[PDB]
Amino acid sequence: MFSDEYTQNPYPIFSTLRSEQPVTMVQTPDGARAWVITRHEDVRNALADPRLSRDIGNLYQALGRQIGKELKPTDEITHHLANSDPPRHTRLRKALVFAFTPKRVANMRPRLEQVVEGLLDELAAQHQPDLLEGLAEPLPIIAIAQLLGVPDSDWRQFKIWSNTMRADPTGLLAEHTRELSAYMADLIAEKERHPTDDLISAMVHAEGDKQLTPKEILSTAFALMTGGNETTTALVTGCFAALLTHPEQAKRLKADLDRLPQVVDELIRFSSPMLYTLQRLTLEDVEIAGTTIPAGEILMLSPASANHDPEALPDRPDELDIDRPRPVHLTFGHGIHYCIGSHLARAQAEISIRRVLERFPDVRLAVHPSELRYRPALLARAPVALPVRL
Numbered sequence: 188m189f190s191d192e193y194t195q196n197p198y199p200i201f202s203t204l205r206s207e208q209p210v211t212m213v214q215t216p217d218g219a220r221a222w223v224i225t226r227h228e229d230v231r232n233a234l235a236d237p238r239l240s241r242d243i244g245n246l247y248q249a250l251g252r253q254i255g256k257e258l259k260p261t262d263e264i265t266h267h268l269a270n271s272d273p274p275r276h277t278r279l280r281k282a283l284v285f286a287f288t289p290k291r292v293a294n295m296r297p298r299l300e301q302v303v304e305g306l307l308d309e310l311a312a313q314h315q316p317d318l319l320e321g322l323a324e325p326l327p328i329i330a331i332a333q334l335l336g337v338p339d340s341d342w343r344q345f346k347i348w349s350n351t352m353r354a355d356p357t358g359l360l361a362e363h364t365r366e367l368s369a370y371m372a373d374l375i376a377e378k379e380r381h382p383t384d385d386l387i388s389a390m391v392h393a394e395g396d397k398q399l400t401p402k403e404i405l406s407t408a409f410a411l412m413t414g415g416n417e418t419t420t421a422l423v424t425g426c427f428a429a430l431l432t433h434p435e436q437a438k439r440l441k442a443d444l445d446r447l448p449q450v451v452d453e454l455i456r457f458s459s460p461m462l463y464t465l466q467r468l469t470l471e472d473v474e475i476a477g478t479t480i481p482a483g484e485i486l487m488l489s490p491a492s493a494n495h496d497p498e499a500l501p502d503r504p505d506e507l508d509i510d511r512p513r514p515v516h517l518t519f520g521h522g523i524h525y526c527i528g529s530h531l532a533r534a535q536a537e538i539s540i541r542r543v544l545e546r547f548p549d550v551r552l553a554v555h556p557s558e559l560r561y562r563p564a565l566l567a568r569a570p571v572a573l574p575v576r577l
């Protein structure tokens with residue numbers, strides 16, 4: 188499956204799979220088997236299915252049995268909510284929801300607008316401006332730094348560490364995790380003494396069962412960094428890619444820019460910046476679309492395929508149409524693990540798109556759509572470059 192044609196445009200393959208092979212077993216780059224689930228109905232149900240596990244210990248045990256080696260238990264910093272099942276997940280999630288509120292995101296928007304305006308100042312000076320390099324790549328970790336409460340004095344080191352929290356180019360996951368942990372532990376202690384208007388402070392001073400331990404707050408911060416950096420980059424890039432490859436619709440959006448909050452969901456659905464969700468492990472035998480998948484197997488659920496499924500969106504699902512009724516989509520997941528950062532991701536996309544279209548009303552792609560490229564993806568997916576003419 189994982190061919191170059193799939194990498195660049197998976198939608199024809201997803202159409203074949205949804206029709207002919209809605210559960211298809213593949214081998215992943217690590218040598219383990221995975222089962223790719225492509226129909227919207229099955230992706231949604233699987234995300235709601237208590238028989239599927241996100242527990243990292245269970246997943247590594249299954250991976251180790253398939254590859255024949257026992258994998259060592261992972262560090263407790265990895266036991267955050269995205270790597271947990273209930274009841275552990277329920278407690279960690281409840282504390283995070285208490286602090287990471289829609290109101291907190293709304294309150295971050297003034298500074299986010301100011302950050303975007305500064306990034307566009309730098310973009311306006313480039314000889315060959317690129318919306319990925321100049322906007323979609325830098326914005327997410329700036330937003331996460333603001334959300335957490337990282338001081339500007341520590342900015343450059345935080346950015347360096349965050350480039351590992353996705354081992355990425357260096358493989359320094361252990362070293363950077365240790366260093367970032369020591370830094371974030373000191374920041375958590377600083378917010379205990381000197382609380383400020385940020386998420387770490389809100390979690391440190393939470394009451395009752397909403398209060399996690401300092402180590403759990405540290406692990407939560409790691410989940411937010413890994414969960415919201417490359418994903419948001421892909422979402423912002425994908426939304427711009429959708430507009431820029433459909434200039435007639437970009438023109439209409441520019442002419443009626445107040446519609447933007449009611450159009451972003453279609454940009455997200457169409458661009459589908461989440462190719463797969465996090466892996467799921469079967470805790471017991473499960474039947475999906477006529478196929479029995481035994482206990483102990485790994486599922487790969489595709490929001491991108493679900494978002495383009497005509498069973499869920501009968502009218503031209505493989506086309507972008509900003510005028511269609513606001514669609515529901517699976518890009519943020521579904522069920523108990525539904526993206527905690529969805530309002531913050533939306534805000535970054537809305538602010539970025541609005542300010543680009545306002546400041547650069549003639550913005551257009553500098554290449555033909557056929558020249559865009561993607562790299563192989565196991566989670567988030569978007570073009571590797573978005574060169575524009577301003």
Ligand code: HEM
Pocket residue numbers: 234268269270280330331410411412414415416418419420421422460461464465466517518519520521523524525526527528529531532567
């Ligand atoms: C600053 C922005 C973001 C932050 C802080 C963030 C953080 C998180 C966290 C902590 C979780 C785990 C929730 C849980 O397990 O209960 C999560 C789930 C998820 N996030 Fe986000 N996220 C952000 C943006 C995004 C974006 C832009 C996308 C899509 C392109 C995305 C897609 C998802 C999905 C699909 C899930 C569910 C995963 C699954 O069920 O397998 N997130 N997010």
Ligand SMILES: CCCCCCCC(=O)O
Pocket residue numbers: 269270410411413414415418464465
């Ligand atoms: C494998 C652990 C991932 C930590 C948070 C990721 C959330 C997401 O799927 O974007």
